[PDB]
Design a protein around this motif. Structure first.
Motif, PDB file in Angstrom:
ATOM      1  N   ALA A1181       0.922  -1.419   0.434  1.00 55.85           N
ATOM      2  CA  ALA A1181       0.180  -0.081   0.281  1.00 55.85           C
ATOM      3  C   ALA A1181       0.784   1.317   0.207  1.00 55.85           C
ATOM      4  O   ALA A1181       0.557   2.395  -0.939  1.00 55.85           O
ATOM      5  CB  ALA A1181      -0.734   0.157   0.885  1.00 55.85           C
ATOM      6  N   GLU A1182       1.741   1.038   0.988  1.00 54.60           N
ATOM      7  CA  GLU A1182       2.904   2.319   0.443  1.00 54.60           C
ATOM      8  C   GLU A1182       3.504   2.669  -0.498  1.00 54.60           C
ATOM      9  O   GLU A1182       3.512   3.455  -0.955  1.00 54.60           O
ATOM     10  CB  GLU A1182       4.053   2.732   1.878  1.00 54.60           C
ATOM     11  CG  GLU A1182       3.700   3.323   2.680  1.00 54.60           C
ATOM     12  CD  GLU A1182       4.378   4.675   1.994  1.00 54.60           C
ATOM     13  OE1 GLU A1182       5.386   4.237   1.607  1.00 54.60           O
ATOM     14  OE2 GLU A1182       4.730   5.931   2.002  1.00 54.60           O
ATOM     15  N   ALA A1183       3.961   1.538  -1.304  1.00 55.93           N
ATOM     16  CA  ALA A1183       4.825   1.503  -2.101  1.00 55.93           C
ATOM     17  C   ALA A1183       4.203   2.034  -3.965  1.00 55.93           C
ATOM     18  O   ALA A1183       4.158   2.461  -4.245  1.00 55.93           O
ATOM     19  CB  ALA A1183       5.539   0.725  -2.757  1.00 55.93           C
ATOM     20  N   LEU A1184       2.637   1.919  -3.162  1.00 56.13           N
ATOM     21  CA  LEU A1184       1.674   2.045  -4.519  1.00 56.13           C
ATOM     22  C   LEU A1184       1.109   3.238  -4.109  1.00 56.13           C
ATOM     23  O   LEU A1184       0.821   4.111  -5.155  1.00 56.13           O
ATOM     24  CB  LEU A1184       0.245   1.199  -4.434  1.00 56.13           C
ATOM     25  CG  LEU A1184       0.169  -0.499  -5.113  1.00 56.13           C
ATOM     26  CD1 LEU A1184      -0.754  -1.135  -4.309  1.00 56.13           C
ATOM     27  CD2 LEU A1184       0.094  -0.181  -6.323  1.00 56.13           C
ATOM     28  N   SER A1185       0.922   4.150  -3.200  1.00 61.31           N
ATOM     29  CA  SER A1185       0.900   5.183  -2.979  1.00 61.31           C
ATOM     30  C   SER A1185       1.928   6.718  -3.469  1.00 61.31           C
ATOM     31  O   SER A1185       1.754   7.218  -3.541  1.00 61.31           O
ATOM     32  CB  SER A1185       0.763   5.221  -1.297  1.00 61.31           C
ATOM     33  OG  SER A1185       1.760   5.242  -0.317  1.00 61.31           O
ATOM     34  N   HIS A1186       2.713   5.523  -3.342  1.00 59.45           N
ATOM     35  CA  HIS A1186       4.171   6.621  -4.194  1.00 59.45           C
ATOM     36  C   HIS A1186       3.843   6.155  -5.892  1.00 59.45           C
ATOM     37  O   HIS A1186       5.043   6.693  -6.332  1.00 59.45           O
ATOM     38  CB  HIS A1186       5.348   5.867  -3.454  1.00 59.45           C
ATOM     39  CG  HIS A1186       5.596   6.872  -1.708  1.00 59.45           C
ATOM     40  ND1 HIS A1186       5.100   8.610  -1.652  1.00 59.45           N
ATOM     41  CD2 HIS A1186       5.387   6.135  -0.671  1.00 59.45           C
ATOM     42  CE1 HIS A1186       5.274   8.363  -0.721  1.00 59.45           C
ATOM     43  NE2 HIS A1186       5.219   7.442   0.037  1.00 59.45           N
ATOM     44  N   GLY A1187       3.373   4.906  -5.669  1.00 59.65           N
ATOM     45  CA  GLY A1187       3.483   4.473  -7.733  1.00 59.65           C
ATOM     46  C   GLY A1187       3.883   3.894  -7.890  1.00 59.65           C
ATOM     47  O   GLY A1187       4.732   4.043  -8.996  1.00 59.65           O
TER      48      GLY A1187
HETATM   49 MN   LIG Z   1       4.223   7.270   2.418  1.00 58.14          MN
END
Ligand SMILES: [Mn+2]
Ligand SMILES: Nc1ncnc2c1ncn2[C@@H]1O[C@H](COP(=O)(O)OP(=O)(O)OP(O)(O)=S)[C@@H](O)[C@H]1O
Ligand SMILES: Nc1ncnc2c1ncn2[C@@H]1O[C@H](COP(=O)(O)OP(=O)(O)OP(O)(O)=S)[C@@H](O)[C@H]1O
Ligand SMILES: Nc1ncnc2c1ncn2[C@@H]1O[C@H](COP(=O)(O)OP(=O)(O)OP(O)(O)=S)[C@@H](O)[C@H]1O
Ligand SMILES: [Mn+2]
Ligand SMILES: [Mn+2]
Length: 1666
Positions: A1181-1187
């Motif tokens: 979820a974090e990686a996706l929040s940064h794309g």
């Molecule tokens: Mn973040």
């Protein structure tokens, strides 16, 4: 510049300058002096004193609470070490928290000290003071990577700056380098010295990484009082009003009186007479002990002797020699009896000597005697000032001329040396003040005056080492272009020192309007890089600014080689170089150019040139010849009498190791075997100080020189020392006394046996499997934990290197029972075959440790020449109209025409019924080729059954998803299906379906009984997709089913078409004739005919540490994505699923470094938050929040769906996938990165290479074209693999059979169905296999040596007889000597039924041949071979151990890194319902998927043997379905029934679930208002409980039977992944008889009888009646 103290006193030849000692000036009462009332921790190190001084007082607030950087500047001998100690304690408290000391792997800390002596002293101090915390303090030393790697496994690492710089430059420890959180830099004024640039490099790179990534690393610096201290503060990035501290001489705990004297600028005895006078004054009148500092091992004794001699004469020994009985007697006895080093007999006169050339015991004795007061005058060297805590009232530094051999001249003392020396002046608790005297010349007094009075500026010396340091930053990848270089240079001390004093550094004044000297930093870098470009160390694009490191630059950085020396080496080394020329190249190094030849040493030099073995062709009395013979004489162990000559030799030899290793790696990378081995031997000569012609026993330090002398007086070859015993050893050596001694030494000499197996892949590449076996006894004292070796492969001529690698032999694996290691590599070969190659395994450190092996090719048979690919005809593109039916043409609305591969294969696929084979690169349209055959098949109104096969379930699932949607509405009905795995359910799908999709195993299971099942015979179409994957693992069953389908159509004359699809094959004739395709039906297209051409870049890496290599590839992938696919999607494949998260973090941090955190995100985060909230894994979820986002097997289906949606809609640009899902990945990118071609395998304890089919599959995802119309890939591999993966990416894929390695598991299924009743039947069956057709083409690949039919038949006979022997020695098959007849036992039946391996079956039968108990079947099940295919993740030990300690049943001999132990622990974790981390939980899922099949197999085994304990095993089947133990109560099956609730119910007398449901209170009892309130469950949880309790819980002549029921066969089992039907076992018997009855597996009003020569549920606990 004239600052000074008060008084001068002129004398006859000297001038005494007396500076008074400053008063303490403690008038400001704001000094706290904090009492040690700190928390319980941080008080244990501070035990020797209960109070902190004023400096530690002022530093405590920011050192113990704040985290910011810090700089302290105190006088010499002030107590700065405890400030660093406070910061260490703060970092410790950061990790260990919550009333509990926690793991130490979460943090590390480095202490950088200028010299080795202080490093070792601080190791001792901090180790002693931090031992109660359990943390380990270790010195970083050894110069060997295998000991430094082990040293870096500790938290407190004390080291020199050069050592830390080279460790970081090698970048093979970054996994642990990232764990550091605090760096202490002691004596930072070293920045003024020529060693300062290494500190500048360290600090600059660390601070830049912390500022561009956000990951903080605290920096604490301890320094002296010198000007420009605020400069080094701002360079250390310290806040001036928060963490800057400057303490004048008033803060010294023992104020020092300075005294300067200088002889008139003749006679140098004046200094000695002045020292004698000062000894008389301080030791005689003042009665104070004192120490003198000189700068030589011999000059210290010389001066002590002179003082004592001048005291002898003139009756002046008095006032110096104490006259009481105790001191005199102690001195006399200790000196005469105990001490051993000569020239130390000055002790009876109270004199002491100290230097690095003495014994450790002698030095400790001197220290103890001086501390006790028995020694009044102690003459010593700087090593005492740097490495001991031995203070004296008076310290005299006699002389200021020290010889520097690197500059080859007499220079002045360094500031840090004199400061450390004067730090020993004045005892803190004995005397009130201290006295420090410096004896120098008249012209050097102002220098030291400014030095000690805070007037010696600290200037940067980085320029002199800029070109080198920049190169290092490039080899690390931290500087890739001009802008990054300037950013780096802006974090150096040179930058701030240039900002302050531009005229002093000759900036040039051209940069007037230059902000932050930006234009000065490019012009300073472009020049440096330019030099690096000309020396071929760097590739430097002048226009774009891009820079990259070459192998020469990497070698120069790794070994601290100047660019000039690298230039000379590269220009001078040639392959025919002998030892003479290699020594000459050593002597032409730039590190030694300043060393001149002197007439003063003309004689000795000559005397040395005649005793050195290597001829020196260079002219006599030339500096190069001088250093050449210096190195040789050092190796020869020759004593020297010249002092400056000895210093020059010490310098040359300290540099010799690095220089010779650089030479070796240069020769290695250029592939020159002879000079490479010679340079490695020279490295060993220098590092072990011995010629190859001397006794190898010299490598053992504890070997007495008498034995070496005796051995070198003998002619016994070294190899004759081995394989003996102490008696024969002494007898062979002519010395019985030594027999046991050297026998223990040669037994520990690194020894290795090797074996080779050659398999030709093509006519130009062989695959070598090398088995390496250790043959020496390990010893940590002289081995460590790992021993490094070099594997070399040389030509027949020994001229070039065909393969080289490092082999690391670990102690744990070396002394194991089965300690054999394997290494698999490839080597090329030319068509006129050489007679043989050579394989050497050569120790990396030990001399004469080499095992050499010929690899003969006289018996080798190269495979048949490959034929040309079928050319891609330039035909008119075939329109869709050619289908002749709008029904079929509607299926392809997007394209008007097919690609040329589809048009060239169209006629034979759509207009004929012949067998077809089409081989084309991934992403070419072959699915349309299969659809052609499908459409022709369905055009015929007969409409027989067609079967599609794919190697893996993911492929059949994607194929089904596509075809069930697209090919449903057609001529008749759709009814296309995919098999499930169990026979009874997919057999109905076969009878029902028109198009059956399956895997090789699923179709195998039902195609065995093809004789009794007409639906298998009536199959008219058979498409084998990805047929090349028969060479992949578990691909032999694919070969089996294809061969069996051919056999079926050959037995039943019914027509059956076969269509095979694969990637471009190197050998397609054999696969085509295998499926009986005609020459014109075998389309084997070139690997370059892909419609979207693929640009393929390869990047090589040389990093032996796997996490370090994986980190090193992170930024290059960021650059590849941003430069090759800036505005297009990209997919990056990594070796592991746990590596996906790590690489996502690494790539995101690389984005942060580039000042663009959301670089790969193209949608506002608020638009994506809706889906981001749904993701289960937080890292994803974090990686996706940064794309970025990733994809791996442990991901839940919903997470995969979200990732796919976000990637396809262009929201995220990058996608990181594990190689485990490269087939499942329904994705496409413009760019594909393959980050690594290796994965760790738990069995072999080594890294295996990617199969070529896997790399082809991964690059087949690169189909999105750019404006160029082409796709892009980048393959990042180790260097040693490059030419391999290149070879089979530009050429087609060779495919071989591994069926010969799995013949037992095939014969199980064949004989169990009576398909193979004899050995001749086995040969006939084998004739139908691709393996058989491939024995004639590549016989040497399979061990065959005679290509004739005689040899082939003999090979098949040997193979089938050995396989039947393996199956007969195991209790599976029945075969004896009479005839080659085989009969399947009851074991083979269930082995083929449950699809379990034959090794698992044998060990099952062996461990279960005796009737065992449930706790034994638990151990036996988890040892199955099926579970050995589960990945082992490094450093997961302990977790498994922590949960194994919380587990009831355990095994006698545990192997904590074994798949058996992992399964054994995880099954019990499932039973106990313990939480598990993500990857371990996925492994447990994989376990549970097969454990039920294994358990049913074991039930059948124990029923076949007739033992009663079979009824135990079926109980196990319940325990896994319901996730509970047999001892546990039934009540734990109910949802939300915590064991707390179980006991709350037990209090109410509830034991069974029947008793629970009977005691519910609709009208039964008034217990409701009490029981419900005691259970604490909500109405929802009570409803979910009622669900399970009411909806799913159950309620020889002959043998009668009577059954009834209280349904949906679906079992309620929330903790079991999958679905089960409620089966039941029926059997009875007697307990004392130990014999079982026949058992029948009952299904679901069914009356079944029993032949007599309980009702056991498989998924519930309310199981049986009695
Ligand atoms: Mn973040
Ligand atoms: N609070 C204290 N109470 C008693 N002794 C102390 C205290 N703080 C430091 N010392 C001692 O003071 C001596 C010098 O302190 P250190 O910090 O170890 O050396 P230093 O200050 O770095 O001296 P140099 O020469 O500049 S490296 C050591 O013997 C310490 O044990
Ligand atoms: N003539 C065509 N023009 C454009 N796109 C096509 C054409 N034929 C196929 N495609 C698409 O290009 C992609 C190629 O995938 P396929 O060729 O079907 O798979 P493959 O290359 O045979 O290898 P597989 O699927 O792993 S067995 C698919 O998305 C097809 O829909
Ligand atoms: N060059 C090599 N030769 C032989 N075995 C090797 C080699 N490299 C790695 N191995 C084996 O593979 C294992 C994993 O190694 P790496 O993960 O690369 O690093 P490492 O040696 O494990 O360092 P750690 O365990 O992270 S402190 C080692 O423990 C060895 O058993
Ligand atoms: Mn210090
Ligand atoms: Mn395909």
């Amino acid at each position: 510049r004239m600052p000074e103290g008060t008084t001068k006193r002129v004398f006859k030849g000297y001038e005494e300058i007396h500076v008074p000692p400053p008063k303490k000036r403690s008038d400001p009462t704001d000094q706290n002096i904090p009492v040690t009332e700190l928390p319980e921790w941080a008080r244990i190190p501070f035990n020797t004193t209960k109070t902190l001084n004023k400096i530690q007082s002022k530093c405590f607030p920011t050192a113990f609470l704040d985290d910011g950087n810090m700089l302290v500047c105190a006088p010499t001998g002030s107590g700065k070490t405890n400030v660093a100690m406070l910061t260490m304690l703060r970092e410790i408290g950061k990790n260990r928290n919550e009333k509990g000391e926690i793991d130490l792997d979460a943090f590390k800390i480095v202490y950088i000290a200028p010299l080795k002596a202080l490093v070792q002293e601080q190791v001792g101090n901090f180790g002693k003071r931090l031992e109660p915390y359990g943390i380990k303090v270790s010195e970083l030393t050894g110069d060997r990577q295998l000991t430094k790697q082990q040293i870096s496994e500790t938290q407190v690492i004390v080291t020199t700056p050069e050592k830390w710089d080279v460790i970081t430059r090698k970048a093979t420890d970054i996994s642990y380098t990232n764990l550091v959180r605090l760096i202490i830099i002691d004596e930072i004024h070293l920045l003024h010295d020529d060693r300062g640039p290494v500190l500048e490099s360290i600090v600059s790179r660390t601070i830049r990484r912390t500022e561009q990534t956000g990951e903080p690393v605290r920096i604490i610096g301890l320094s002296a009082t010198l000007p420009n201290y605020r400069d080094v503060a701002s360079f250390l990035r310290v806040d001036f009003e928060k963490g800057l501290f400057y303490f004048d001489g008033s803060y010294r705990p023992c104020p020092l009186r300075q005294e300067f004297i200088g002889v008139t600028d003749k006679q140098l005895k004046t200094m000695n007479d002045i020292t004698y006078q000062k000894v008389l004054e301080h030791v005689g009148q003042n009665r104070n002990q004192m120490l003198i500092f000189v700068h030589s091992r011999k000059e210290t004794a010389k001066t002590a002797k002179y003082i004592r001699d001048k005291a002898l004469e003139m009756d002046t020994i008095n006032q110096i020699l104490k006259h009481d009985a105790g001191t005199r007697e102690v001195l006399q006895e200790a000196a005469s009896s105990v001490n051993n080093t000569d020239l130390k007999d000055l002790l009876p006169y109270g004199f002491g000597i100290h230097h690095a050339g003495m014994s450790r015991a002698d030095r400790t004795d001197v220290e103890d005697l001086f501390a006790s007061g028995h020694i009044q005058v102690l003459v010593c060297t700087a090593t005492l000032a740097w490495g001991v805590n031995l203070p004296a009232h008076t310290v005299i530094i006699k002389g200021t001329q020290v010889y520097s051999p690197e500059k080859g001249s007499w220079v002045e003392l360094s500031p840090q040396d004199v400061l450390q020396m004067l730090g020993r002046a004045g005892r803190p608790q004995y005397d009130t003040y201290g006295e420090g005297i410096i004896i120098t010349t008249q012209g050097e007094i102002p220098y030291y005056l400014s030095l000690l009075n805070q007037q010696l500026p600290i200037e940067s010396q980085l320029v002199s080492k800029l070109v080198d340091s920049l190169n290092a930053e490039i080899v690390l990848g931290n500087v890739r272009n001009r802008d990054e270089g300037v950013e780096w240079l802006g974090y150096t001390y040179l930058f701030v020192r240039m900002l302050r004093s531009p005229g002093l550094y000759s900036v040039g004044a051209e940069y007037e309007d230059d902000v932050a000297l930006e234009q000065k930093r490019v012009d300073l870098i472009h020049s440096a890089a330019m030099v690096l470009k000309k020396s071929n160390l760097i590739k430097y694009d002048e226009k774009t600014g891009k820079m990259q490191a070459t192998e020469l630059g990497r070698i120069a950085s790794h070994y601290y080689i100047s660019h000039e020396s690298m230039d000379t080496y590269n220009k001078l080394i040639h392959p025919a170089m002998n030892d003479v020329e290699l020594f000459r190249v050593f002597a032409q190094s730039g590190e030694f150019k300043y060393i001149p030849v002197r007439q003063e040493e003309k004689l000795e030099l000559a005397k040395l040139l005649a005793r050195v073995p290597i001829p020196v062709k260079e002219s006599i009395e030339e500096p190069t010849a001088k250093i050449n013979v210096l190195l040789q004489a050092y190796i020869s162990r020759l004593k020297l009498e010249g002092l400056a000559l000895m210093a020059d030799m010490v310098y040359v030899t300290q540099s010799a190791g690095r220089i010779l290793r650089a030479i070796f790696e240069i020769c290695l990378k250029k592939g020159w075997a002879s000079v490479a081995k010679l340079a490695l031997n020279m490295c060993k000569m220098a590092e072990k100080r011995m010629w190859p012609t001397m006794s190898p026993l010299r490598q053992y330090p504890t070997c007495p020189a008498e034995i070496i002398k005796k051995a070198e007086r003998m002619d016994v070859p070294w190899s004759s020392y081995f394989d003996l015993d102490p008696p024969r050893m002494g007898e062979l050596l002519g010395m019985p006394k030594a027999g046991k001694t050297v026998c223990a030494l040669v037994s520990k000499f690194p020894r290795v046996e090797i074996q080779g197996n050659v398999q030709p892949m093509t006519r130009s590449m062989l695959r070598i499997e090398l088995t390496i076996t250790p043959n020496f006894q390990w010893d940590v004292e002289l081995h460590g934990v790992t021993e490094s070796f070099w594997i070399l492969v040389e030509d027949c001529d020994g001229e070039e290197i065909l393969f080289h690698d490092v082999f690391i032999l670990r102690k744990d694996l070396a002394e194991a029972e089965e300690n054999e290691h394997t290494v698999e590599f490839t080597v090329p070969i030319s068509e006129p075959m050489p007679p043989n190659y050579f394989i050497s395994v050569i120790s990396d450190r030990w001399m004469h440790s080499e095992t050499r092996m010929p690899v003969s090719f006289q018996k080798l048979i190269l495979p048949e020449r490959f034929p040309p690919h079928t050319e891609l005809l330039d035909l008119q593109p075939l329109p869709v109209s050619a289908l002749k039916a709008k029904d079929y043409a509607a299926l392809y609305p997007n394209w008007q025409q097919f690609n040329k591969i589809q048009t060239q294969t169209f006629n034979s696929l759509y207009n004929t019924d012949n067998n077809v084979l089409v081989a084309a690169p991934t992403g070419s349209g072959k699915t349309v080729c299969a659809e052609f055959a499908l459409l022709r098949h369905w055009a015929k109104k007969d409409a027989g059954r067609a079967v599609y096969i794919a190697p893996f379930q993911e492929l059949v699932d994607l194929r089904f998803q596509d075809w069930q949607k697209r090919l449903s509405h057609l001529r008749g009905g759709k009814e296309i299906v995919k098999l499930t795995g169990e026979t009874t359910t997919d057999l109905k799908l076969l009878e029902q379906g028109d198009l059956i999709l399956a895997t090789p195993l699923q179709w195998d299971v039902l195609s065995r009984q093809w004789k009794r099942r007409k639906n298998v015979q009536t199959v008219e179409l058979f498409i084998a997709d990805d047929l090349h994957m028969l060479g992949g693992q578990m691909g032999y069953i694919y070969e089996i089913v294809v061969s069996r389908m051919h056999f079926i159509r050959t037995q039943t004359e019914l027509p059956m078409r076969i269509v095979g699809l694969s990637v471009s094959l190197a050998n397609a004739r054999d696969i085509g004739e295998w499926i009986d395709a005609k020459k014109h039906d075998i389309y084997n297209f070139s690997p370059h005919v892909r419609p979207v051409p693929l640009e393929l870049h390869i990047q090589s890496y040389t990093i032996p540490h796997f996490p370090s290599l994986m980190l090193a590839m992170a930024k290059p992938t960021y650059l590849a994505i941003t430069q090759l696919s800036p505005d297009q999607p990209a997919i990056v494949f990594v070796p592991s699923r746990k590596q996906t998260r790590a690489t996502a973090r690494d790539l995101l941090t690389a984005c942060l470094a580039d000042d663009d955190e959301d670089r790969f995100l193209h949608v506002e985060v608020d638009q994506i938050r809706k889906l981001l909230d749904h993701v289960q894994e937080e890292a994803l979820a974090e990686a996706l929040s940064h794309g970025v986002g990733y994809y791996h097997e442990a991901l839940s289906q919903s997470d995969k769906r979200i990732v796919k949606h976000l990637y396809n809609n262009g929201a995220i640009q990058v996608l990181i996938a594990s190689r485990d899902v490269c087939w499942e990945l329904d994705f496409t990118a413009h760019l594909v990165v393959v980050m690594g071609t290796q994965f760790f395998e738990g069995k072999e304890h080594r890294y295996i290479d990617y199969p070529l089919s896997e790399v082809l599959q991964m690059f087949g995802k690169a189909l999105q074209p750019s404006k160029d119309g082409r796709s892009r890939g980048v393959l990042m591999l180790p260097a040693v693999k490059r030419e391999y993966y290149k070879k089979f990416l530009n050429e087609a894929l060779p495919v071989e059979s591994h069926l010969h390695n799995f013949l037992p598991d095939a014969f199980v299924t064949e004989i169990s169905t009576k398909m193979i009743e004899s050995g001749e039947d086995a040969i006939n069956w084998a004739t139908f296999t691709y393996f058989y057709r491939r024995l004639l083409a590549n016989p040497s690949y399979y061990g065959l040596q005679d290509p004739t039919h005689d040899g082939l038949s003999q090979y098949l006979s040997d193979l089938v007889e050995t396989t039947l022997k393996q199956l007969s020695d195991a209790r599976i098959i029945e075969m004896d000597e009479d005839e080659g007849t085989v009969a399947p036992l009851n074991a083979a039946m269930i082995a083929a039924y449950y699809n379990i391996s034959y090794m698992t079956m044998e060990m099952f039968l062996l461990s279960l041949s005796h009737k065992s108990k449930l706790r034994t079947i638990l151990e036996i099940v988890t040892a199955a071979t099926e579970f050995e295919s589960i990945q082992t993740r490094r450093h997961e030990e302990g977790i498994l151990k922590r949960i194994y300690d919380h587990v009831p049943v355990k095994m006698n001999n545990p192997v904590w890194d074994s798949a058996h132990f992992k399964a054994f622990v995880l099954v019990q974790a499932h039973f106990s319902r313990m939480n598990l981390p993500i990857d371990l939980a996925k492994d447990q899922e994989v376990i549970l998927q097969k454990i039920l099949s294994l358990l049913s197999a074991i039930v059948d085994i124990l029923s076949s043997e007739g033992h009663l304990n079979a009824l135990n095993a079926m109980e196990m089947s319940q325990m896994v379905v319901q996730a509970m133990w047999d001892r546990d109560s039934p009540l734990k099956q109910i949802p939300n029934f915590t064991p707390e609730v179980v006991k709350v119910a037990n209090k109410y007398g509830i034991n069974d679930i029947f008793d629970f449901m009977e005691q519910m209170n609709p009208e039964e009892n008034p217990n409701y208002a009490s029981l419900v309130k005691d259970l604490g469950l909500t109405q929802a949880q009570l409803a979910q409980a009622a669900n399970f309790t009411n909806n799913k819980y159950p309620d020889p002549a002959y043998l009668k039977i009577h059954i009834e029921r209280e349904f949906d066969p679906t079992v309620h089992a929330p903790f079991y992944p999958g679905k089960k039907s409620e089966n039941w076992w029926l059997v009875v018997g007697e307990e004392s008889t130990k014999t079982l009855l026949a058992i029948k597996r009952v299904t679901v009003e069914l009356n079944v009888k029993l032949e007599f020569v309980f009702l056991m549920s498989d998924s519930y606990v309310g199981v049986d009646q009695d």
